[PDB]
Write a protein that binds this ligand. Sequence first.
Ligand SMILES: N[C@@H](CCC(=O)O)C(=O)O
Ligand SMILES: N[C@@H](CCC(=O)O)C(=O)O
Ligand SMILES: [Br-]
Ligand SMILES: [Br-]
Ligand SMILES: [Br-]
Ligand SMILES: [Br-]
Ligand SMILES: [Br-]
Ligand SMILES: [Br-]
Lengths: 263, 263
Amino acid sequence: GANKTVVVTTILESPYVMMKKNHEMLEGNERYEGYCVDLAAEIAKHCGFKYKLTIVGDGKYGARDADTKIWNGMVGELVYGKADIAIAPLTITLVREEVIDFSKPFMSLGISIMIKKGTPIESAEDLSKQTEIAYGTLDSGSTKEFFRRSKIAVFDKMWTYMRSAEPSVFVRTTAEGVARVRKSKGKYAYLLESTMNEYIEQRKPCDTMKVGGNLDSKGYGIATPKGSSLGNAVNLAVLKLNEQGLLDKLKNKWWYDKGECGS
Amino acid sequence: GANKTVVVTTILESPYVMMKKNHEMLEGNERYEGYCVDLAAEIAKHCGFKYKLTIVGDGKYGARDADTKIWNGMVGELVYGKADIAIAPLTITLVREEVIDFSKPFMSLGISIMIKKGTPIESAEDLSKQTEIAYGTLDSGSTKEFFRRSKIAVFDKMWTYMRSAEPSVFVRTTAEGVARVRKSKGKYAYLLESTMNEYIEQRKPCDTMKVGGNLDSKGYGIATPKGSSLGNAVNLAVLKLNEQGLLDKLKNKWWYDKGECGS
Ligand SMILES: N[C@@H](CCC(=O)O)C(=O)O
Ligand SMILES: N[C@@H](CCC(=O)O)C(=O)O
Ligand SMILES: [Br-]
Ligand SMILES: [Br-]
Ligand SMILES: [Br-]
Ligand SMILES: [Br-]
Ligand SMILES: [Br-]
Ligand SMILES: [Br-]
């Protein structure tokens, strides 16, 4: 059949996808900017397709409801045919690989700890051994599932705390978690992916920092519906852009060239 | 058809695959030990197959001869049907992805610089701006191809030097490169993957070190012949073992628990 505009699902997450300053006066894909906006343009060019960026309807990454078995977020939009490809900071996980296809990773990351500067915390073990400082995760993503499923002693203890903590320690968006770190003044630490942590560390008011090593090691992938013909070309495009140094260029562009906390 | 023993191609590369001390008195898979030996056992268990470890015939990772178009190394053994799966520190690259299938990565790495302690070199740019210190790569792997294909200014200059340097700066095995660093006493630096660099840094005589950041970012994958039915199960196995923390355990086992240069 004739070529057709590719529906891209993505998510408003800085610096991956952000509304341009003058977005109210702009239309279509020009409303948005960021790492994944640049990446979408490069993938489309190499694969030779036109595309339309759309923000995932429920603003979620993707989880399977245990009772109804329904997928939400960007994963759901792929599973149920509402989008042709997801170009976002979407983590490659076993449960997702079973229902959608993933390119080889375009970015590496791991779960990490964000603290308000001066917080007496250096590690996940530190967090698990105390109760003065609360901590939590994004409410429906791969980080929360990591703790839910972990059988590692320290991470198991953290999950037991987080799942029952009052008031809730989970947040609906990364921005809410950052905000809670900043205004709790050392009494909340946020568990999030090192990429987003490192980005926020370079943003004013420059009052947070990443502490300790990463808790795990994983990657983001471009996702397509299982068996989609688009998957092969997209995977080769990712590998080409990585070897060309383009992915490194985009990381430096959106994380550090634009750093607001000094050189 | 009935189940059949899976032929695994791998390569003698420390600490991935090594001859056991008493290998002369042992048979079959028991002759070998290392990260990839443990990994092979875990993958086979989760996928439910028996296997036989074999060392790649020509001792090479894999490259395509430009004139004959013939693949050598572990890639060739997969392409031409001599092995069913490769379980080794085999880098995922575009040219290889076109001819074989790769799991999602089981280990991350990047090209890195190894120096004799005290060598006045901190970066690839440092190397490219001088001639007193020679430098080279493994003779037929992904690192050499990286420099051959790079259009980045600094890496292009390094390749122009290395490809024409006299005497040859390329080595047949990692051990030869390490040996040349050690006995050139600061007048040779070796370009190799950060994983192998980090391992050697923890081995006696503790006279080398990794300097600077990595030049790129990539991963190792389990490789199967293109379209092989084994690929899907192996990929899910890799993802499961990563999320279980097994891959991290194996890295610590073979790199740092066994470190010989202190704590
Ligand atoms: N990248 C994650 C969302 C962020 C997080 O869970 O920390 C996902 O794909 O679910
Ligand atoms: N891992 C590399 C070999 C080592 C190197 O090139 O430095 C490959 O798969 O070709
Ligand atoms: Br997940
Ligand atoms: Br991955
Ligand atoms: Br580029
Ligand atoms: Br290659
Ligand atoms: Br990769
Ligand atoms: Br385990």
